[PDB]
């Protein structure tokens, strides 16, 4: 027989082929072969259900579809399935793999006795052998759960997005879990901007023992109360009183301390670790983890189970016993408990073979070697003996004041040996062995000034931790949430920290007001739990979908109504005194999907009195200083102006090289604005950075009726070049003869000759649409020699054919910045080229 195994990745195909062999043919079904419709390719409801594909009213008929370019793979798979006798669906463990397997099954057909569903948590010889030995049936319940999730997300996206376009702005999007993540980020932004840092001082003391050892302490009580001076003068007075006073070590405390290793990684823990230690965010972490799994070195990277197989435990215990030895074993395995709702059938993220060191990963990029090293170190650590520390605490008294030191010294290191700390902590030091009731001699003392930390801005990993705490989303979702909140323009990530765009605040407020049930964290968690119940087969998918859809439709039909009826409030204006360059009027501050901008109230006046003039802002970037550490965010908050009408901080924008604009955090709910010539941090336009040959200024990339094009930033220069098929920058035009006699082949347009730094090329009169480009032939140029400008005529003089009679083409040598002509046969270069050396054509072999 020949048995066909269908696997999503090609790398997964290669790795599984390593262990399957000659009896099995492995075919890589790249991605989702079958998906709901995307492109355009009571009639309003009909068009809505055709756009969705899903029809919620007619019992969720789905109209799945197979996307452009999948059909080739579908044909190949069908042919192989006709050839093969048993078809093996070896997708990944999770619901996405089950959905892919179901799609494959349904396309190929023959369902009942021709499909085996293979389930392995690692691509290794023993795991694959055990998986193929007894294959499973396709678990339709998990497929139904995945379909339910997909249907919910498409229902919410397509039904909400036109509402947001009408009320707020075109080019918005919405999503069930996405909106709740944006709500989390916006709530933290509001907590931060509300915060008003207090000020507190601290004093530090330097002391020597009678035995000449040296000790440094911190001062924490005055008059038996907490020591916390409010101002400089108070601190200086305290320092004086301290210096005058005489010090004695009235307290001597000691105690052992133990530290246990961390649990083996679940996906959220792996993302947090990779962010903190290696700096990888979410996308890079999961991409490298997927590569490491597909290569076969680590277990499946979507898990919330800390469980480990007996095989894993025995392997790692063997490794510890052999390398480290008995002191680091310890006597019995370190158990770790995952959530009761976790996929306890799954394993943790662990090495597939503990002896494979990270350096040995010849075929993994260095970042993936680092991620594997992190996984390996954690896995080894988790089973080792706890570290052992002994700790000393000292308190010293002088006058009205008491001052403290704490120190720990490290005496067995077992798990810390494999998994060291990134840096020494404040308590990772040696306090000298002062006696109980010892004496001390004194050295000069230092004050310090501090401002209370605001709540810390989310990192990608700390947002994933927050989601994991609340129960919003699941291990497979987290990377998609973190990506989509950025891609959709409601949140931006900078300094590895999350910042919330004003449009995210507007949309968050509107969605909270209208769709309070959808946006509430508890109902999101309960929905996720109900999908988990579906996957358990505790619940019926269509049922919960109907319940969701009924509630959602009630809330939508309420929300659609007029604002006086109680629907979604419009994007209300806030108004400021500035003169519109077209009509001088007062100007107001506005938010669009593009950003935050300055608009003139004539936009709301009918055509007769309409004004479309707009002014375009650049926000000040916060530049957090890594060297300031924990201070870096606090000082950023200190840097901001504060609104006159309210305590909320203000956010800053640049309107002229002479002028700068401050806007309140609760805009447009708060209407405070400030204008100042003083100019904090500034930015500008970008795109393929090109140099304008006409004025030497910077040239940027812009699109529109000219589609992909490049225009110079100088207001005195309107020079424009164009993007072509296979070149960067943008040859301008100079010779944009609309050669009507050369027709396009992929479209009905006609070719036009353009010039630029890339060279001389032919492009469709509709590059924005046709975007069809090809290099001209010498015979083609000779056909239309007359239309060529005076300079380019030399190209027409170049020899049209090589000595072999093949046809020539005009090319641009970037290393020499000159045009030449080269011949090609069968699409490959013939190796013959002619250049123009001193008024004659030097032809020769390349």
């Amino acid at each position: 027989g020949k048995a066909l195994v269908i696997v999503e990745s090609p790398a997964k195909a290669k790795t599984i082929n390593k262990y399957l062999g000659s009896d099995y043919v492995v075919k890589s079904s790249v991605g989702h072969i079958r998906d709901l419709p995307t492109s355009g390719s009571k009639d309003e409801r009909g068009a809505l259900v055709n756009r969705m594909g899903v029809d919620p009213w007619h019992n969720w008929e789905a109209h799945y579809e197979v996307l452009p370019g999948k059909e080739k793979v579908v044909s190949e798979l069908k042919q192989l399935a006709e050839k093969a006798d048993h078809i093996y669906l070896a997708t990944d463990l999770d619901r996405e793999g089950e959905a892919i397997a179901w799609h494959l099954r349904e396309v190929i057909g023959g369902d009942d006795a021709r499909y085996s569903r293979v389930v392995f948590n690692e691509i290794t010889k023993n795991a694959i052998r055990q998986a193929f030995n007894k294959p499973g049936e396709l678990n339709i319940d998990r497929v139904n759960a995945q379909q339910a999730r997909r249907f919910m997300d498409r229902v919410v996206g397509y039904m909400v997005s036109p509402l947001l376009w009408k009320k707020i702005a075109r080019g918005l999007s919405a999503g069930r879990v996405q909106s709740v993540a944006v709500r989390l980020v916006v709530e933290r932004e509001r907590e931060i901007k509300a915060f008003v840092p207090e000020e507190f001082w601290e004093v530090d003391a330097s002391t020597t023992t009678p035995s000449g050892e040296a000790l440094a302490l911190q001062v924490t009580h005055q008059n038996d109360k907490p020591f916390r001076p409010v101002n400089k003068e108070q601190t200086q007075a305290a320092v004086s009183l301290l210096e005058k006073a005489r010090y004695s070590v009235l307290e001597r405390e000691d105690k052992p301390t133990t530290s246990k290793p961390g649990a083996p990684f679940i996906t959220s823990t792996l993302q947090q670790a990779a962010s903190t230690r290696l700096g990888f965010g979410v996308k890079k972490t999961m991409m490298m983890a997927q590569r490491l799994y597909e290569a076969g070195y680590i277990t499946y990277m979507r898990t919330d189970s800390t469980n480990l197989s007996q095989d894993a435990v025995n392997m790692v215990r063997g490794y510890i016993s052999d390398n480290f030895g008995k002191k680091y074993l310890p006597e019995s395995p370190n158990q770790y408990a995952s959530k009761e709702n976790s996929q306890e059938a799954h394993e943790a993220i662990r090495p597939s073979d503990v002896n494979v060191m990270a350096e040995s990963l010849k075929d993994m990029e260095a970042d993936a070697q680092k991620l594997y090293q992190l996984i390996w170190r954690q896995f080894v650590a988790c089973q080792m003996t706890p570290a052992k520390y002994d700790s000393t605490t000292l308190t010293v008294g002088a006058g009205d004041f008491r001052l403290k030191a704490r120190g720990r010294i490290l005496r067995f290191d077992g798990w810390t040996k494999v998994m060291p700390a990134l840096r020494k902590g404040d308590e990772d030091r040696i306090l000298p062995a002062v006696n109980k009731g010892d004496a001390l001699t004194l050295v000069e003392l230092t004050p310090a000034q501090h401002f209370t930390k605001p709540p810390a801005r989310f990192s990608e990993a700390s947002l994933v931790k927050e989601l994991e705490k609340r129960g919003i989303g699941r291990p497979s979702t987290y990377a998609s949430i973190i990506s989509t909140i950025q891609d959709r323009g409601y949140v931006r990530v900078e300094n590895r920290r999350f910042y919330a765009e004003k449009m995210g605040e507007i949309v968050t407020d509107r969605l909270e007001e209208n769709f309070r049930e959808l946006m509430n964290y508890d109902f999101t968690a309960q929905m996720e739990n109900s999908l988990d119940q579906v996957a358990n087969h505790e619940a019926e998918w269509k049922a919960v979908l109907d319940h969701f859809f009924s509630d959602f439709t009630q809330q939508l039909d309420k929300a659609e109504k007029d604002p006086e009826e109680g629907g979604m409030r419009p994007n209300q204006m806030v108004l400021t005194s500035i003169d519109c360059p077209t009509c001088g009027r007062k100007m107001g501050i506005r938010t669009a999907s593009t950003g935050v901008f300055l608009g003139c109230s004539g936009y709301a006046l009918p055509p007769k009195e309409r004004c479309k003039t707009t002014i375009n802002l650049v926000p000040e970037n916060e530049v957090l200083n890594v060297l300031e550490g924990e201070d870096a965010e606090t000082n950023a908050l200190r840097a901001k102006r504060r609104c006159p009408k309210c305590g909320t901080a203000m956010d800053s924008y640049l309107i002229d090289p002479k002028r700068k604009l401050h806007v309140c955090g609760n805009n447009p709910t708060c209407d405070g604005y400030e204008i100042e010539e003083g100019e904090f941090r500034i930015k500008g336009y970008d795109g393929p950075i090109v140099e304008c040959e006409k004025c030497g200024s910077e040239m940027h990339l812009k699109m529109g009726r000219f589609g992909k094009y490049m225009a110079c930033t100088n207001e005195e220069c309107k020079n424009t070049r164009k993007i072509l098929r296979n070149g960067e920058v943008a040859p301008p035009k100079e010779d944009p003869v609309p050669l009507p006699e050369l027709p396009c082949e992929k479209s009905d347009a006609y070719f036009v000759l353009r010039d630029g730094a890339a060279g001389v090329f032919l492009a469709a009169n509709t590059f924005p649409k046709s975007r069809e480009t090809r290099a001209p032939l010498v015979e083609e140029l000779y056909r239309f020699r007359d239309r060529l400008p005076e300079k380019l005529r030399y190209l027409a003089d170049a020899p049209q054919q090589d000595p072999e009679g093949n046809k020539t083409m005009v090319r641009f040598s970037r290393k020499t910045k000159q045009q030449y002509v080269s011949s090609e046969k069968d699409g490959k270069a013939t190796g013959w080229s002619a250049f123009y050396v001193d008024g004659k054509w030097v032809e020769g072999k390349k």
Binding site: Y794, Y836, V837, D838, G839
Partner: protein, 38 residues
Amino acid sequence: TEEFDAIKIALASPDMIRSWSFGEVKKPETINYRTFKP
């Protein structure tokens, strides 16, 4: 001509060599072939 009496030699200060030069050359091109012009 210059009626020098002796010859002196020393290391070249960068300001001195920059003072010698009547310009900086920044690109590898040598001579045009379309017209024999630099």
